[PDB]
Structure formats: C-alpha cells, structure tokens
C-alpha cells in the first residue's frame, strides 16, 4: 500500500498551495520536497521510515493565530521535511486503524 499512501499524503500537502499559490522560501522548499518525493517515492518512503525510527527530536514549530472575530484558532507551521513524514503517518495510521 505504501506507494499509494504516499501519493495521498503528498497530494494533501500540495492541495493547500494549489489554493494558496504564493510561495516564499518555505513553500518553495515544500513544493520542491513534494515534487522530489514523487520522483524519489521509494527513496522518500525510506527517509520517512528512517525518520520515524531514529530522529525523535525536531526543529521548532512556529505558531500563529487565525482571527475569527468571536474566537481565535491556533495555527502551527511544522517544518516541510517533517510534514511529509507526519502526512504519510497520518494516512497510514488511519488506514490501519
């Protein structure tokens, strides 16, 4: 299943930028990593598995609030190279669950 689960993960991430369109660095780094992850897809799975086994300590998260006039919501931007690992893991956990 993994190659198909990775497709679902990468296309979820890409969907946000297809709406958002404007790319600073970090969206350019993420779209480069997503496009890479397609041509890498067996390699990208090998990173994702290695990340899930080894890494255990992570780069800082940024936080921002979304202004709905009755209540804020808290928005977090995880680092792109991790988001693909989290995104595969989200699809995989829900599939097996």
């Amino acid at each position: 299943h993994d190659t198909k689960l990775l497709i679902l993960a990468l296309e979820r991430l890409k969907e946000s930028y297809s709406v958002k369109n404007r790319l600073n660095q970090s969206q350019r780094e993420e779209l480069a990593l997503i496009e890479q992850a397609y041509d890498n897809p067996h390699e990208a799975l090998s990173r994702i598995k290695r990340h899930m086994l080894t890494q255990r300590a992570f780069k800082e998260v940024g936080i921002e609030f979304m202004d709905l006039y009755t209540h804020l919501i808290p928005v977090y931007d995880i680092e792109p190279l991790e988001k693909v690992t989290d995104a595969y893991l989200d699809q995989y956990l829900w599939y097996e669950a």
């Binding site: 919501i73 808290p74 989200d90 829900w94 599939y95």
Partner: peptide
C-alpha cells in the same frame, strides 16, 4: 485507501 479524510479536513483549520 484514504480513510481519515473527513476528520482530517477539520484539523486542516489548525494546519492552514
């Protein structure tokens, strides 16, 4: 194979 997706779209409000 996409199984989470309806709860997941609600959590996108925290991601995006």
């Amino acid at each position: 194979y996409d199984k989470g997706w309806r709860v997941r779209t609600e959590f996108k409000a925290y991601q995006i």
